[PDB]
């Protein structure tokens, strides 16, 4: 049952490992009571220790599970942070395939959907720069999940939003309001709306970055659900 699967994550046979990992992912996508059993069975440390395995075949699977475990409550996110997950996840954002990175980004967004202290831990782990870089360098698919990670960071407190700005988030975000697909624009405006709820220096940084014309312009857009959200980003900007 669970302790045997956990023991198997450190197995020397790659097929029993890989099959163990897959069972664990299954459980980890089973809602918060299922996640609680993984935590209480000791799964979390060995799982995170797999983020350094030689094949991305193991790694992808371990990140997918971690993404799901971070969908749980904030106490559960906290256990993931204590098991050391942040550093290897951040490391994957530049040293791994786009396939893995999408999963890493998803994991990281969910962790950032935790409380402010947990968002602080993501920053200290150096998340902000590789996330921002993805916005210029990655496929629209990956960019869409990165923008959502960035937005969750932007819902944190003012010191946190200033760190994003320092990491260069503004111009790439502003640029996404135009030269991108409608699903990405939506994600981008939501991130900007969060920033726009900042203090007056940040608004000003927002205005400097060219945000207001882009929001005014493409409020009146084919999709009228973005109209609505573009609206509220301007209202939030005061």
């Amino acid at each position: 049952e669970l302790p045997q699967m956990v023991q198997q994550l450190n197995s020397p046979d790659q097929q029993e490992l890989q099959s163990a990992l897959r069972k664990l992912s299954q459980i980890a996508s089973g809602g918060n009571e299922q996640i609680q059993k993984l935590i209480e069975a000791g799964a979390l440390s060995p799982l995170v220790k797999l983020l350094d395995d030689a094949s991305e075949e193991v790694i992808k699977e371990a990140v997918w599970a971690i993404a799901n475990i971070a969908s749980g409550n904030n106490e559960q996110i906290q256990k993931l942070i204590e098991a050391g997950a942040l550093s290897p996840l951040v490391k994957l954002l530049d040293d791994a395939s786009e396939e893995v990175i999408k999963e890493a980004v998803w994991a990281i967004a969910n962790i950032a959907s935790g409380n402010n202290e947990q968002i602080q831990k993501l920053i200290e782990a150096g998340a902000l720069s590789p996330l921002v870089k993805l916005l210029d360098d990655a496929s629209e698919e990956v960019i869409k999940e990165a923008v959502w990670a960035i937005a969750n960071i932007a819902s944190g407190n003012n010191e946190q939003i200033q760190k994003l700005i320092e990491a260069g988030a503004l111009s790439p975000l502003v640029k996404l309001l135009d030269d991108a697909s409608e699903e990405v624009i939506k994600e981008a405006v939501w991130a900007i709306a969060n920033i726009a709820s900042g203090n007056n220096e940040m608004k000003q940084k927002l205005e400097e970055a060219g945000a207001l014309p882009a929001l005014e312009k493409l409020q009146s857009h084919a999709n009228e659900e973005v109209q609505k959200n573009a609206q509220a980003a301007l209202e939030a900007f005061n």
Binding site: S29, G31, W64, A67, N68, A70, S71, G72, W106, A109, N110, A112, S113, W148, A151, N152, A154, S155, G156, W190, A193, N194, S197
Partner: peptide, 9 residues
């Protein structure tokens, strides 16, 4: 400020 967790099946 919107803040969003996604679980995946």
């Amino acid at each position: 400020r919107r803040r969003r967790r996604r679980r995946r099946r």
